[model samples]
Target: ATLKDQLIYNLLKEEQTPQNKITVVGVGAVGMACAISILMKDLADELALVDVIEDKLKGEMMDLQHGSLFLRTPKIVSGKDYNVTANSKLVIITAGARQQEGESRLNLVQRNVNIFKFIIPNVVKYSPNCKLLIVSNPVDILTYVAWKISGFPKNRVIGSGCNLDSARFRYLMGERLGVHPLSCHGWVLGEHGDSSVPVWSGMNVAGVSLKTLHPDLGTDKDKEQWKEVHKQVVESAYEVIKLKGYTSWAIGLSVADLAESIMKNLRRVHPVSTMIKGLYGIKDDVFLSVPCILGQNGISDLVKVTLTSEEEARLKKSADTLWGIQKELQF
Candidate 1:
């Protein structure tokens, strides 16, 4: 090994960092919050923040280092290269160009596809066995792109999919019920964007069927009301984007939730993005969010939800939407 690479490795070992390291490939808005969320959850024993700009990257590393004392304290590594990311167990890709105002997630694809062409290869080079958790914009497509480019086992590459959308779903459902969001059980599946499907058939409040708990929900008028709430969940990110130049906190929490499940081998189910070729008769090469069992080995299984025929059709429609966009992408 080169002297500098050897020095970096030795320094990491000296700091007593655990072998279960996580490397986040961007330190901008989303990556910074993702690293912090991982720290707060004590998910990764060591974290390597990779980014091109030195000053901002170091600033985030310093913030995480300062915050570490209060938490389980993962070792923090900052660098411009992936050399320090060797042997990482999970590498999160949150690096890419931000979507412009009035732009759709599909709109950012061309440039970000170009971005991943280089970044994803370096990730495989440094940590050949590390699972990839993609969080960049246009995540479904990017996750598919990462899977294709890295050639990792199908289970090892995933996207932070409708987990965030699901969280938003529960939140909005709870808002109508006047209770805490986490108390509601609901899922936003399908694609992570406009076509995302909120499974009302599967929704409940603490095991109480939503329809029974709120008979109004059964009425057509109330159904539209709930769809309005669901619409808010689907479009809220763009609203947040318009208000604040970017979104970080909720998506950050979503990434941490998945990271914890993976590192702790929780084997928990989340609505994450994966390529579905035959399920529901979907035939295209595309990644769309569906319920998945995640653990140390990555996606261990997919959960089957009993959907109404209408819901099933909507799910299929979302898959077709993503495939159409996938075909249009240069990748």
Candidate 2:
């Protein structure tokens, strides 16, 4: 089957039920964009908006609900209570401080970790059966905290980690090769922040490895160019922030993609932050970005793809950084 056909098949296979409910927590710019995308795509039968700020949440919900008359009408709610989310199959948490100029997402770690302590317990109490998707800054750490606080199964909690970063990497490479970004198969592993590593060895275009497809592209394909591209991928967020003061569109679209995956039960492979139970010989009680099959049950499977020794070491270093911060947050 063609790639498009395969994607459709996977999406259809994941749909165990037709009407799925998704609750979005924190209707900031990113959260608002995600909610709109889900409605526009007709991905959710019921959509609930939860936020601590009553007026802001209600305004956002009203604006969205007003637009629904022209498109799909989702059950949008605004409140601090969790009952609005009780029936949701998926809960996306995007509630946290926005990253500031000259600040890395890791800098927000301690704050968001504390936020999760209050948020996760309430979510667990009300939406006990819902899968949690963390979209806050320092997502990997926050996701781990949520999992531990909620005491939920590892598969039921995931964070929007390197998925957006990986997408940017593919888009840049596609620009150079004149291919669609979705047609490129690659990953940005490790953290979603500065230390993230792109797996160049696994880079491919439409199932063909980059090295094999373009030998004339130069002998420095595996190392030199890869280093430059990796730097660009890691710095992409800063570049966007430098211009706009914040980034919401791309990452917001990623949130919608993840919600659709769960709603449709698509067992599609994507890089998300999930708890590692000793994979790659790294066992820190924090979330890290790795390839996983996302579906109705959250992370249905983990894929530990082969990495070069250098790549593996870099990944370990990224995990070590997050684990250290997580330890401090817990204290």
Estimate TM-scores for all models.
0.90, 0.89
Tell me the tens digit of each residue's lDDT in model 1 across 1-331: 8988877754245344357799999998899889888888878778999988899998888877886669785578889888878889999999998775578887878888999999999999989999999999789988998998999988999999899999988887777789898788888888888888878778897688775656565235785467787788878888998999889999999999999999999999999999687777787887888889999999999987877787788889998877887787675
Number of clashes recorded per candidate: 0, 1
- The regions of model 1 sitting more than 4 angstroms off are 1-17, 212-220
What is candidate 2's lDDT per residue for 98-177, written digit by digit as tens? 78878989989878877888888888887788899999989888888888888999999999999998989888888877
Worst 10 residues of 2 by lDDT: 215-224
Off by over 4 Å in 2: 1-19, 212-224
Local distance difference test, per candidate? Answer: 0.86, 0.83
Best by TM-score: 1
What alpha-carbon RMSD in Å does predicted model 2 have with respect to the real structure?
8.9
